[PDB]
Amino acid sequence: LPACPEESPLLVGPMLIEFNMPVDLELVAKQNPNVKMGGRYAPRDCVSPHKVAIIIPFRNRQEHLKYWLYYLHPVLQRQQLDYGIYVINQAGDTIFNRAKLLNVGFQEALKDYDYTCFVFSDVDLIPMNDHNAYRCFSQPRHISVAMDKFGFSLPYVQYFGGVSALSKQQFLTINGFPNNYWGWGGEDDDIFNRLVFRGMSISRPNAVVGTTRHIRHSRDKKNEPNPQRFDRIAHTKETMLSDGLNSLTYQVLDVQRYPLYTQITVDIGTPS
């Protein structure tokens, strides 16, 4: 097989995105025949240079996830990516830890295949233009740049939350993500700090291509804003040295290969 072209010729650009109709994953699987068990896909006609593991931090967001799968799968295939979907389900009912789940995702996906790119996506964010590439670049990539919830523009120029993509080397270079941001807030800013402290800059598509929809939702229980977040992001430079991949432990409780995704239920513990 020849290499796929640099930019996919299958893209159609702007798309209509809606969250008011029911979704049946059996039907989605039928509509996405080429997606193999566990949510894996690679083009039949050419070799993609993008071996992407898409990591979703998760707990009790099945409805959002259904929308995510319905919209992203068609888009990811048009982008001609060699990809896999991983939903990192946090076991238990204690305080949520988005970033630690993301680290679990990186480490576990690597056990399945030689992925060299990682897209970290919240479960409720849908891209509105398939020209917004869900793969890696020479610098860390911020993907969800123009979210409807922020008035279709960045909330601040150093905002790196929502959806992003880091190559395997970029992720390893920053010792991954912090493991001690329990509850909502700041871990994305910590991550931005890590990248900057390791000589990188944020790459982004333009605001039109990067237009993204956030599924309106209410606060989840057990993910209360973390009061010590402002203090933690002020010391990233020092803490990133020993907090992240090199200080990570967890216990996978279950791995389920669904037609459209692999769900890893994991026990990431509680504080300290």
Ligand X SMILES: CC(=O)N[C@H]1[C@H](O[C@H]2[C@@H](O)[C@H](O)[C@@H](CO)O[C@@H]2O)O[C@H](CO)[C@@H](O)[C@@H]1O
Ligand Y SMILES: NCCCCCCOP(=O)(O)OP(=O)(O)OC[C@H]1O[C@@H](n2ccc(=O)[nH]c2=O)[C@H](O)[C@@H]1O
| Residue 44 or 219 with smaller CB distance to ligand Y | 219
Instruction: Retrieve residue 181's tokens.
Output: 């941001």
Q: How far apart are CA 116 and CA 53, in angstroms?
A: 8
Give the one residue of 71, 189, 262, 268 binding ligand X; rule: CB under 6 A. 189
Indicate whether 125 belongs to the interface with ligand X (CB under 6 A).
no
Answer yes or no: are the C-beta atoms of 53 and 106 closer than 8 Å. Answer: yes
Residue 171: count other Cβ atoms within 10 Å of its Cβ. 23
Contact residues for ligand Y (CB under 6 A)? 56-61, 96, 98, 122-124, 184, 218-220, 223
Minimum distance from residue 171 beta carbon to ligand Y (Å): 18
Q: How far apart are CA 113 and CA 110, in angstroms?
A: 6
Please identify which residue in the block is written with the tokens 């509680």: 270
| Residue 122 or 190 with smaller CB distance to ligand Y | 122
252: amino acid identity, one letter:
V
Helix count and strand count (H, E) for the chain:
7, 11
Indicate whether 65 belongs to the interface with ligand X (CB under 6 A).
no
Minimum distance from residue 5 beta carbon to Mn ion (Å): 34
The kind and range of the H/E element at 262 are strand 261-267
Strand partners, 165: 119, 141
Minimum distance from residue 27 beta carbon to ligand X (Å): 33
Binding mask 118-157 for Mn ion (x = CB under 5 A): ------x---------------------------------
Answer yes or no: are the C-beta atoms of 57 and 265 closer than 8 Å. Answer: no
Binding-site partner at residue 13 among ligand Y, Mn ion, ligand X, none, CB < 5 to 8 Å by type: none
Binding-site partner at residue 219 among Mn ion, ligand X, ligand Y, none, CB < 5 to 8 Å by type: ligand Y
Return binding residues.
Answer: 57-61, 96-98, 123-124, 184, 186-189, 217-220, 229
Q: Which positions touch Mn ion (CB under 5 A)?
A: 124
